[PDB]
Each structure stands twice: as C-alpha cells, then as structure tokens.
Amino acid sequence: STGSATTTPIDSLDDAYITPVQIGTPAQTLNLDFDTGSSDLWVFSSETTASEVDGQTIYTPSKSTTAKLLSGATWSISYGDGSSSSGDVYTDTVSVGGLTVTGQAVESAKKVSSSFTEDSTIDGLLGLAFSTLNTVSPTQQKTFFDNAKASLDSPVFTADLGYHAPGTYNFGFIDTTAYTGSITYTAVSTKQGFWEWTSTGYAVGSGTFKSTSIDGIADTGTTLLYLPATVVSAYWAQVSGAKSSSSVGGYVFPCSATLPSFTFGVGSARIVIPGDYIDFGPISTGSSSCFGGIQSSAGIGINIFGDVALKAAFVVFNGATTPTLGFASK
Numbered sequence: 001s002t003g004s005a006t007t008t009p010i011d012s013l014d015d016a017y018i019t020p021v022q023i024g025t026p027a028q029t030l031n032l033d034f035d036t037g038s039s040d041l042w043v044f045s046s047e048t049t050a051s052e053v054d055g056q057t058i059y060t061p062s063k064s065t066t067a068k069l070l071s072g073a074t075w076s077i078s079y080g081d082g083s084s085s086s087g088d089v090y091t092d093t094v095s096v097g098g099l100t101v102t103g104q105a106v107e108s109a110k111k112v113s114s115s116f117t118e119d120s121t122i123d124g125l126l127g128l129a130f131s132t133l134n135t136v137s138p139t140q141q142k143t144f145f146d147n148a149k150a151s152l153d154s155p156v157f158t159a160d161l162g163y164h165a166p167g168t169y170n171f172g173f174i175d176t177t178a179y180t181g182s183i184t185y186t187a188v189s190t191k192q193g194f195w196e197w198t199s200t201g202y203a204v205g206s207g208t209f210k211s212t213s214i215d216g217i218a219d220t221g222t223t224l225l226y227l228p229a230t231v232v233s234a235y236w237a238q239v240s241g242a243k244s245s246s247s248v249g250g251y252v253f254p255c256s257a258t259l260p261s262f263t264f265g266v267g268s269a270r271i272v273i274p275g276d277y278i279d280f281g282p283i284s285t286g287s288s289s290c291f292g293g294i295q296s297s298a299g300i301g302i303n304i305f306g307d308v309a310l311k312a313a314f315v316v317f318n319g320a321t322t323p324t325l326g327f328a329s330k
C-alpha cells in the first residue's frame, strides 16, 4: 500500500504545516501537524476542556462506530517549546492520503496548553519519530508509520515541504519526479528516539564550505533551523545590522536586508537554503526588525534541522530495519 497527502502552511510565514487526516467511522477529518520529532498522535476532542478549545476541529469518539476506549491508558507530553497536552486514549481507524491503519492509538486531549488553544489551525499532532518516545502509559503505543510500515510497498515516508506553498507527505514510495539530481542517504541513530544524523558541514552565502560534523535531528514539527552558536554567529555576521537579542529571544535583522543563503552538507552532497527561507518577518506587527530563521541551539541540548532546512530538500525517512535519512535538492 501507499498514501499521499498534501501538507499546507498554516500562515504566510510557514510557521507549521497541516495535513488532513481521517479518523473514525464515518470519517472525521482533522488537520494535524506531522511531527518527525515526536511520537504521539493526539487530537483536540469532545473531551478537551471547553475553555481550551478556540476554533479547532474536534474528534468525537462517541460518533465513531470503530472507536474503542483503550482502558486505563493516559498520555502526557511536553514539547521543546514549552507547550504540553494530556488526556486519555482511543483506538480507531486512521487514514492519511488513502493509507489506512486500523487500531491506531488516537490520544484524545483533555487538557492542552495555551499555545495550542491559541492556534485555531492545528487540530492535533501526528508523531513520526520512533515509537520508543510515545508517552502512552501504562502500555506504550505505536506511531501511525510503525503500524503501517509492514503493509507499505517500501518502509519509508517522504517529506516535501513547500516554501510559502503546499507540499506533500508520501508513505510507502519515493516519487522520483519530486526532486532533482540524486537522493543522498545518511546514517541515523535512533538512540534518543529521533531521526538523528550528522551533517558534514556548512557554508554561508557564496563562502567556502566548512567541513565539520554537526549532529542533529530532522524535525518537521520545528519551524526553524537550530545550530551551534559558532555556526549561527558566522551566518548572521554576513547580515548588516543583525544581532542576537535576549529580549526578543534570538537573532533579529533589518527587514530591509537581503539575506544570504545557507548550505548544509549531507555526505558529499549539499543542500542550499535560499536566503528568503530564513526571513520570519517582523518581530511585532509594523516593526522594521525581523526574526531570523537560523537560531542558536545552545539552550536546547540538540541541533534541530527544522522546517527552514527541510523545506529546501526532498527528505526520505527510511524506516527499514537499519534506519536512514535521504536528502535531495528539488
């Protein structure tokens, strides 16, 4: 089997991408944030505290003839940005782009933190990291991909995120028309539960490539590119007037600037992030100061190849026995 679904930016900055997901019978379609940095499929629901729902579409398990409460199971998750959610668990039929999994754990939110409430466009998350990170207790549950992978034509999914435009998540096949030149694969460590890999270095604009190992995670659920402070300083030094602001929470730059590209290495291959992809717009409405798309990871504990990096590539998440990542230009 295969599936293919369009993923759409939630706003004009590509802050996140939503993908329609069919849950239950008859289908209830919710727009979920596909997150290769986490492993829970959770949704706003009829059980979510009413004051914490503000425009999201909800899953109502009582209206699904295939929903079954997973007795005794609870979940609770906290994300790197400080947001969180928790609740109970149903199993139900879940389909993405024509690919159907029966008995998928659908984690129904009883509580969500304010950042989720305040974003009416995201109805939940669909985790695509390794199932070892799933938070369901006392019986950990499998991700959608883990449940589907034995049925897929090939045990892979691909992320093809658009710049200020829709893109595609495919399951079970590699669309050879969706990229240019060849797919360069690299080794993954699953020891922390992430799609963790080592970039071979970077370049700023037309500058020389610096060969240096940068361990990080491929994370579709993170907006920006978080890299070591040395790398980030080297990038922003090429932008007149750019500085790190403790007040704002990162590097800012004149909105009048033309940003240089940023290149990262994948083995001997190179992925070029155009400068425009690094512009996240005014820090506040009407400000002439803009928020950078490359930021320091120093306070995180891990480097994160988020959407800024991934949307410059066609990315293969190879979930074979010995997992790997592939990157192609497009």
Ligand SMILES: C[C@@H](C(=O)O)N(C)C(=O)OCc1ccccc1
Pocket: 184, 185, 186, 187, 188, 267, 322, 324
């Ligand atoms: C030969 C290899 C390399 O980079 O040395 N290469 C080009 C390549 O794509 O290797 C990807 C891979 C990593 C780990 C396990 C299986 C496959």
